[PDB]
Design a protein around this ligand. Structure first.
Ligand SMILES: [Zn+2]
Ligand SMILES: [Zn+2]
Lengths: 171, 64, 138
C-alpha cells in the first residue's frame, strides 16, 4: 500500500563541497538517493513531499576522513505491501511454474500450485499462456491478485500472490 | 505348535533361531495384537516425560 | 453423535474435543474445524465424507443445534421462501381464506422443494422464486 510518512536519514558529504550553496548539494544527494529506491522497513520509496521546508538541522564532523555527518528530516511517500492484500497488475514474465505480475514498481510471482487446477499451462503458444476453462492468461492481461506473503529484505522487497480463491483470476 | 497356538495360547520364549526358540511356559489373554506398526513404536519411545506432579498438573492443562 | 463428527477425527472426545464441527449447506456433513481449515485454503473441492462428491465452497458455513439434516435444511428453505413472496395477498386487506390459500400454495411448494419431487415443479418454483424476485424489483 502507498503510504506517506515523515522520515529521516544521515548524509555524508565530501569536504570539497563545503561552500555556501551546499544546501542545494544537500538537496542534490537527497533526490537521487532516496526517491526511486526501496527499504525493508518502509517499502519501495516513491516521492518526497515539500521541497522548501526541509529540516537541514545542523552538521557534525566525524573524527576520521574529514567528512561531515548530518540528519535531514522530511516528508515522503512510500509503497509498502503487506500480507492478505488484494492488488492488481499485469504479467511481464512467465514460467512453467506460474508467472510474474508487475504491480507498480514491484514484480510479484504467482506459483502454479497457488492457482486452480483447471488452469493449465499452455507451452507451445508464443507467448506461453495459461489456459483455464473460460480464460486464457497471457502477458498483457490484467489479473486481480491477493498477496499471500512478502519478503522484507533490505532494499529488495519481494512477495508471493495467488488467484485460487473466489473473485480472483483476471480482472 | 507354538506358532499355530499364537495370541496368548503359547507365549513361549523365542530365544534365537540358532537356539530354535528355547521356549518357556507363559500365556497372556490376547498376546499377539501385532497390528501396531513399528512407526507407532518409535513415536511411542520418542516421548520424554515431565515426572512427579508435573504431568498430573499438565493433564489438567490438557484435560485429564 | 460422538461416534461420527469428522471424517478424519470422528471421536476426538477422548483427545479433548475442543473444536467445533461445521456443516456445509451444500454437503450436510459433520466436518471439524482443524481439517476444514486445510480444505478451503487450497481450493474448493469436495469432501470425502463417505466418498462424497458434492463440491464444498469456501466459507458460508453455519453452527447447528442439530435438527437432523431434514429440518435443518427445511428451516433455511422456509426462510428463503418467506422473503421472496413476503406478505403478498396475505395481510394486505385483512384477507383470511385468500391468505390461507396463498399460504397453502407456499407450503405445498416448500413441501415439493423439501421432498425434491423430480426437479420439475422445483425448477418451476425456482422460476416462480425468480418471478417473486423480479416482482419485488418493479
Ligand atoms: Zn479429523
Ligand atoms: Zn459433501
Amino acid at each position: 500500500m502507498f503510504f506517506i510518512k515523515d522520515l529521516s536519514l544521515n548524509i555524508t558529504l565530501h569536504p570539497s563541497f563545503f561552500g555556501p550553496r551546499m544546501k542545494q548539494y544537500l538537496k542534490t544527494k537527497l533526490l537521487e538517493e532516496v526517491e526511486g529506491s526501496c527499504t525493508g522497513k518502509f517499502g519501495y520509496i516513491l516521492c518526497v513531499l515539500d521541497y522548501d521546508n526541509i529540516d537541514i538541522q545542523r552538521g557534525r564532523i566525524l573524527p576520521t576522513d574529514g567528512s561531515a555527518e548530518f540528519n535531514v528530516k522530511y516528508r515522503a511517500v512510500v509503497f509498502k505491501p503487506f500480507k492478505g492484500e488484494v492488488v492488481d497488475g499485469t504479467v511481464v514474465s512467465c514460467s512453467q511454474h506460474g508467472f510474474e505480475v508487475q504491480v507498480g514498481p514491484m514484480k510479484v510471482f504467482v506459483t502454479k500450485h497457488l492457482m486452480p487446477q483447471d488452469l493449465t499451462f499452455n507451452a507451445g503458444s508464443n507467448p506461453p499462456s495459461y489456459q483455464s476453462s473460460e480464460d486464457v492468461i497471457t502477458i498483457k492481461s490484467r489479473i486481480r491478485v491477493k498477496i499471500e506473503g512478502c519478503i522484507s529484505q533490505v532494499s529488495s522487497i519481494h512477495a508471493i500472490g495467488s488467484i485460487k480463491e473466489d473473485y480472483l483470476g483476471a480482472i | 505348535t507354538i506358532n499355530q497356538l499364537e495370541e496368548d495360547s503359547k507365549i513361549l520364549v523365542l530365544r534365537t533361531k540358532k537356539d530354535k526358540t528355547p521356549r518357556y511356559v507363559w500365556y497372556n489373554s490376547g498376546g499377539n495384537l501385532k497390528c501396531i506398526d513399528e512407526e507407532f513404536v518409535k513415536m511411542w519411545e520418542n516421548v520424554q516425560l515431565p515426572q512427579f506432579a508435573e504431568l498430573p498438573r499438565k493433564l489438567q492443562d490438557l484435560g485429564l | 453423535e460422538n461416534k461420527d463428527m469428522c471424517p478424519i477425527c470422528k471421536t476426538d472426545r477422548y483427545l479433548s474435543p475442543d473444536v467445533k464441527f461445521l456443516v456445509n449447506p451444500e454437503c450436510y456433513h459433520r466436518i471439524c474445524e482443524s481439517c476444514v481449515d486445510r480444505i478451503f485454503s487450497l481450493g474448493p473441492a469436495q469432501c470425502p465424507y463417505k466418498g462424497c462428491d458434492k463440491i464444498l465452497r469456501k466459507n458460508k458455513f453455519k453452527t447447528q443445534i442439530f435438527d437432523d439434516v431434514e429440518v435443518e435444511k427445511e428451516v433455511d428453505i422456509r426462510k428463503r421462501v418467506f422473503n421472496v413472496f413476503n406478505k403478498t395477498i396475505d395481510d394486505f386487506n385483512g384477507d383470511l381464506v385468500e391468505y390461507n390459500k396463498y399460504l397453502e400454495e407456499v407450503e405445498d411448494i416448500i413441501y415439493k422443494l423439501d421432498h425434491g419431487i423430480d426437479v420439475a415443479k422445483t425448477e418451476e418454483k425456482l422460476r416462480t422464486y425468480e418471478e417473486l424476485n423480479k416482482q419485488l424489483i418493479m
